[PDB]
Amino acid sequence: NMVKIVTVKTQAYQDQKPGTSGLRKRVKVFQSSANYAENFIQSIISTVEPAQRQEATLVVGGDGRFYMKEAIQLIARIAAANGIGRLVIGQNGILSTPAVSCIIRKIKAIGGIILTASHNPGGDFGIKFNISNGGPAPEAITDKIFQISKTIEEYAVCPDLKVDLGVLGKQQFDLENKFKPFTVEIVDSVEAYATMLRSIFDFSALKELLSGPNRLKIRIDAMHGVVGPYVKKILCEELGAPANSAVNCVPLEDFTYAADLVETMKSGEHDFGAAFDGDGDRNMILGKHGFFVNPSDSVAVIAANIFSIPYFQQTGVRGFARSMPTSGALDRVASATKIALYETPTGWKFFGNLMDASKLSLCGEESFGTGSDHIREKDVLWAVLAWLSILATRKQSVEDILKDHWQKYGRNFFTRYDYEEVEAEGANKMMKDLEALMFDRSFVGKQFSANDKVYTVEKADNFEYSDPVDGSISRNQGLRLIFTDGSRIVFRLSGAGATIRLYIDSYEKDVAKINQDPQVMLAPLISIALKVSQLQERTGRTAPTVIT
């Protein structure tokens, strides 16, 4: 049954520049701008030179939420008309971002499209393009996508073509005036991903950890996002944790905090807790009674126990890496090995480039946690299994693992202050001023005291990074005050109003102070950061918006 191909005239929009995250615009502008979605999808596909489209395949994958199934049908209706040979789509459109990265690299696909949406899109909607390496397309190619979208006059579509996203296996489509049929492979949303995880961790050890009378009781709150089905399938059905272990594991099409987990952990039944947000980005790891594990500490605890995981035990640790605002806990375990450590600007794309050069195995970001080279994307579920592998071999509580880690390496106390929606004029004043402060001659070596704790400036710069892989240079990535005792203050702005991020990292070696409230131990450096920055006078803010 021959499906028509038609060319559709269009007006070009001028604000479809994607960046590190994809295109993310409000849903209302998608519904109220004609051909917004199509121009962009067409612009993505137009980066694929036409002679390489039949032997190419795209992995397309969705959030679960409202609008996704229609945007998948559209991608198909456009990719077919342009002669892309094959789409791989997860059943019902469900494909988490680690899953898309995974499949892209397993089947050697040309790239992928990842759809995303906000909790309650009454609310926005994202379209992100990944490339053959399974990671987000780099600036070189996002600039080409924008260039095309700005001068696009027409796109191609099969307006008659419809795909049954909930039926597994291959479907084929005969397009008029084409010889090869257009193919769509509907794949189990979880299968490929769980096969990868089964090759990385010891599912035998984990099954013995979560079943039995001496088992380890866990609660994983997936907060109604895409990782849900991966948690239920991998952690309950395969590994054997009781069904009540995984919570909120069905993605909801419509409708923010983490306190449900904190309350239930305070009860005392469970030994290990983890909560994710809707996006699958920001996330939390708790121990018994609510013991908090700092994301910067997980990176380090995992690094120091990294061979409890068969993957690294068998592949090696080719390198360690850390985003510049992330705490220096990782630095202390790396410095006891001959593994190099890299300090990258904020951005997972920077880890990806060292991974591609075979020079990075384990990495961490304060705002997310720990990742590896197994994919080119962040994986919360990976990070949860890494922690459970370590509980299984250490046979100790989360709290006792952290305590013995600090006992050996010392403790990096760490917090981040977010000031949101700040008067942008004053924000840039605050940092331009602060910069000139630290570039002054006598500034290095100046001393600061607060409550008989003395800090003296060892180095003060505005972090720059030369990517050793793509050659690019990234300036003004945040201002770092580094002190001789190994403590740090870092300041960043970020793009809706302005947003200030203030990171504080104090190193304590004294054992009588290891086990202390981080907000108390950090109070001296907080005070120093706010005097120097003059943050209250440039912003009016007397408290951060969030403390983390």
UniProtKB/Swiss-Prot annotation:
Its EC number is 5.4.2.2. The modification N-acetylmethionine is found at residue 2. The modification Phosphotyrosine is found at residue 342. It is an enzyme of class 5 (isomerase). Keywords: Acetylation, Carbohydrate metabolism, Congenital disorder of glycosylation, Cytoplasm, Disease variant, Glucose metabolism, Glycogen storage disease, Isomerase, Magnesium, Metal-binding, Phosphoprotein. Mg(2+) binds at residues 118, 277, 279, 281. Alpha-D-glucose 1,6-bisphosphate binds at residues 24, 118, 281-282, 346, 365, 367, 378. Phosphorylation at Thr-456 by PAK1 significantly enhances enzymatic activity. The active site is at residue 118. It comes from the Eukaryota. One of its GO terms (biological process) is galactose catabolic process via UDP-galactose, Leloir pathway. Its cofactor is Mg(2+). Binds 1 Mg(2+) ion per subunit. The modification N6-acetyllysine is found at residues 17, 338. CDD domains: PGM1 (cd03085). Monomer. Catalyzes the reversible isomerization of alpha-D-glucose 1-phosphate to alpha-D-glucose 6-phosphate. The mechanism proceeds via the intermediate compound alpha-D-glucose 1,6-bisphosphate. This enzyme participates in both the breakdown and synthesis of glucose. This is Phosphoglucomutase-1. The lineage of its organism: Eukaryota, Metazoa, Chordata, Craniata, Vertebrata. The gene is PGM1.
